[model samples]
Target chain A: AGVDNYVIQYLKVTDTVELPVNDRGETKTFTAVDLTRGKRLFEENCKNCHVGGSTLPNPLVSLSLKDLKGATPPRDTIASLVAFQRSPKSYDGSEESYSCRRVSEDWLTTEQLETLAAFILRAAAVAPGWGVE
Target chain B: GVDNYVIQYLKVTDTVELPVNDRGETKTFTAVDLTRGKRLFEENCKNCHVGGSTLPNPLVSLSLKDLKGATPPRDTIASLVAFQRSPKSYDGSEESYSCRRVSEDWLTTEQLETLAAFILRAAAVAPGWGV
Candidate 1:
């Protein structure tokens, strides 16, 4: 119940933050300021094949096991997601395994990247086997 | 049914390596071989007070809610006695803290020592005894 309530509250807060500011001689609100919306957009478009929760496409949960098994693995998916968000098209050609063109073009708006990072941090806090202590 | 099994198993394996004083040709279980026993004691008994598994007094569960009085006294003895006794006693109810029948089937004596040591080391891992 607490987790569910937290998730709902988070969604509401993100929605409010994304609202455009009205300019009526008052403080000029920034345009396209919603981080949650940006995160949602990324989830809809990129998360299926990139990373997110257990159910997300290419779920990043297995990364830990991969590390234990000895392989070139990324750190926490949050870090990887953030890094990818910053530069979606910087991979070398030979090792250019996945296509970033659609991800870079369709989903990753600058504002969205910030929101996606925030969401990942919150989820990591309550994941099972993760000791808050 | 499941929980009862767990507790029985834990106690049996631990009983075998009974604490020893000297390692005279009596198989000579070194102070080191006793490492397993030490680990078991830490995880099973010391866990009651210092640290261990859940239930039998959830130590380190509460935090200092300044709104309340000073930190609740950590019940060191009650914690230890909870499991040390034959019929485990608990504040809430017997079922609340019984090792549960299930735990009995889980660990062996050797395995018990391995776990005990692991838990003891884990508890001491943090700085400052965690008092």
Candidate 2:
């Protein structure tokens, strides 16, 4: 049988700040601009498989294009395109080192991750012949 | 020997702040907020050219028409468009110098072009001029 039963999960991080309370027993809040926290989260959790173009290692690199069907561009091409779309740097640059797993673990809080994923799914509808010839 | 020109002018490297007019008398203004200024620049300028998934080429791929002024657009705004369209600076100054001039001390000239290009192409259409 073809590949099936894929599962998706999400997580969140908390931002610490407080806001003025209204008549109700609720308070508004904000958080610090935690760059160090964000960076640590990225490094500890995401550095294993995605750094230094290690994903492009020979065996994995070849498989990267395995998903492309007839007349479709190679996986590397798609990856490069996506990378360029995200940042101005070429594929060799640091911006291309992003992945959903990384975003889940490090970038956003659990609540934010779920919301973001939902938004992405809703927005990223199937385009006819999107990657096809 | 190659051709030589007259006495060359010296380039000054100083941090000078210019004041704007208000009343008949000139009121002193305070220093800029560097952090906020940087953030504003990043939001308006750097996010595109420096952000994720930009094109490999220094030149941006988007083409903008109906621009006023000269053929090879050369004004502050036009320089921005041209920056992405063409990676090289038309002013013959270094990219860094060009960005500094346009950004007005907020960013290097080269960075200004990169950021400007990204901002210009964020959407197919911008808010003003009905274009």
Candidate 3:
């Protein structure tokens, strides 16, 4: 009803990802939309500054849906979020956001990138007091 | 002994350019917008750096000599911008949070550049500034 509903609504679980080879040379795979993986990635890369979607450095601009939409270019969609991750810009898009680390393709694969964006968007849409608290 | 305090102009009265790398050619200035720079200083930096004087660390003010005397020398616009981004101590051994950390989100590249230019210009020309 909460995260799952928003996940379905925001992210299309269409793409498949090939997981690492398992024991005895068996291969496993996972479809898109893994919020836990996204959460893990966020913890590894973003939690230092963005704890619970709140920007520690700049509390004025939280990662709420409203804030995402309010940004100059609107970081509400998966594409926009990915773009921001690639090259972070200020809220007004006036200059490069040095506070936010730039995520390169080498750091996060395409599939993982979409997953992270999807998780952020889904949470922003449904999580109670997500960015605020 | 002789007199009391001194008056200094808030805005830079000289023309300057956007600082470039050593190899890169410097761009000529159309305008640096000292008004915007003054406003930014008034809003964010005036409390700690009143009239170019650093109140937190009274030993070190925003004078040209002090700025140049710093470990990396924050006498230029680019150097000043770097300091604003992440302020370090006089010895550059530890971080100093006395001054507000200005980020791109807080002020755009242009805005920060103007602020740095304003500080550098004030240090160069403003009479009795950072005394």
Return the top candidate by lDDT.
3
Question: Which consecutive 10 residues in model 3 chain A have the weakest lDDT in total?
Answer: A18-27
- What DockQ results do all the predictions give, each relative to the true complex? 0.01, 0.02, 0.02
Q: Over all chains combined, what TM-score does candidate 1 have? A: 0.26
lDDT of each: 0.34, 0.29, 0.68
State TM-scores per candidate.
0.26, 0.23, 0.44
Q: Evaluate candidate 1 and give its CAPRI docking class based on DockQ.
A: incorrect
Looking at model 1 chain A, which ten-residue stretch has the lowest summed lDDT?
A19-28
User: lDDT per residue, candidate 1, A1-133, as tens digits?
Assistant: 2122334454333223221112122221212233345445544544423333332212232223232123223323444445554554222212333323133535465445545554544444333432121
Off by over 4 Å in 2: A1-107, A122-133, B1-75, B89-131
Question: What are the per-residue Cα lDDT tens digits for candidate 2 across B19-54?
Answer: 111223222211122223223344433322233212
| Model 1 stretches with alpha carbons more than 4 Å out | A1-35, A47-52, A55-80, A86-94, A99-102, A105-107, A127-133, B1-131
lDDT string for model 3 (B13-112, tens) is 3445544433454533323365566657766676557678876687778998998889787776778888889988998889986557778998898988
lDDT of 1: 0.34
Q: What is model 2's DockQ versus the real complex?
A: 0.02
Q: How do the residues B14-74 of candidate 1 rate in per-residue lDDT, one tens digit apiece?
A: 2223211123211222234335544444433432333233323344321222101212222
* Residue pairs whose backbone atoms clash in candidate 3: none
The per-residue C-alpha lDDT of model 3 at residue B38 equals 60
